[PDB]
């Protein structure tokens, strides 16, 4: 019937020059051709963390440290504290 | 396949590809730990000997 061609041309003309083909906008004044791929390119970027999580910053954290090559000094300190703890046993 | 207009999957793929070697693992527990352990067995054998002879006495 009339609708069988009218609505198909309606949904094949305006959507054609609305997106996918990505050129011009006939039905309504605001264009989404430069809105969804350009202005909304930073949309999720604004929603998410930018320059930290989107770029996955290669934060090279300081490597795990140690006793800094502590000499026998800490050894006899441990000896002394163990001795004074065990003296009252 | 989920994303159609990705424009970012290649960038993140490359970023992870270049990130897996984060840095060299330390694995250097051989400068104060080793000295502590050496003293450990030395005076531990000393204490074992002294407690043994005390038990015999």
Q: Which of B10, B20, B28 is nearest to A64 (CA)?
A: B28
Contacts of B22 (CB under 8 A, 6+ apart): A58, A60
Contact between A74 and B32 using a beta-carbon 8 Å cutoff? yes
For the record, the structure tokens of A79 come out as 């000896």
Phi, psi of B31 (to 5 degrees): -125, -35
Local structure of residue B22 (DSSP, 8 states): -
What is the chain A residue with the closest CA to B9? A54
Q: Which of B55, A48, B1, A67 is nearest to B47 (CA)?
A: B55
CA dist A67 → A54, A73, A79, B26 (Å): 37, 12, 17, 14
B26, A63 contact by CB (below 8 A): yes
Contact between B23 and A37 using a beta-carbon 8 Å cutoff? no
Name the experimental technique: cryo-EM
Question: Helices A72-87 and B33-56 sit at what angle, rounded to 10 degrees?
Answer: 40
Contacts of A24 (CB under 8 A, 6+ apart): A17, A31, A33
For the record, the structure tokens of B46 come out as 């000393």
Interface test with A, best of B32, B41, B47 (most A CBs within 10 A): B32
Distance CA B37, CA B31 (A): 10
How many helices (H) and strands (E) chain A has is answered by 3, 0
Distance CA B13, CA B10 (A): 5
Which residues of chain B approach chain A closer than 8 Å at the C-beta? 5, 7, 12, 15-16, 19, 22-23, 26, 28-29, 31-33, 35-36, 39, 43
A58, B19 contact by CB (below 8 A): yes
Q: Cα-atom radius of gyration of chain A, to the nearest Å?
A: 35
What is the resolution of the experimental data for this entry, in Å? 4.0
Q: How far is A79 from chain B (nearest CA, A)?
A: 10
* SS3 category, A24: coil
* Maximal C-alpha separation, chain A: 105
For the record, the structure tokens of A63 come out as 């490597």
B31, A66 contact by CB (below 8 A): yes
């Amino acid at each position: 019937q009339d609708l069988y061609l009218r609505e198909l041309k309606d949904t094949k003309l305006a959507p054609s020059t609305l997106q996918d083909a990505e050129g011009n906008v006939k039905p309504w004044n605001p264009p989404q051709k430069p809105n969804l791929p350009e202005l909304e390119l930073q949309g999720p970027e604004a929603l998410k963390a930018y320059t930290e999580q989107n770029v996955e910053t290669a934060h090279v954290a300081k490597e795990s440290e140690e006793g800094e090559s502590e000499p026998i000094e800490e050894d006899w300190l441990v000896l002394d504290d163990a001795e004074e703890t065990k003296e009252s046993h | 396949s989920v994303l159609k207009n990705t424009s970012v999957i290649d960038k993140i793929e490359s970023y992870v590809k270049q990130y897996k070697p984060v840095k060299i693992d330390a694995s250097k527990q051989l400068q104060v730990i080793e000295s502590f352990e050496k003293h450990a067995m030395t005076n531990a054998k000393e204490t074992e000997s002294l407690v043994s002879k005390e038990l015999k006495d």
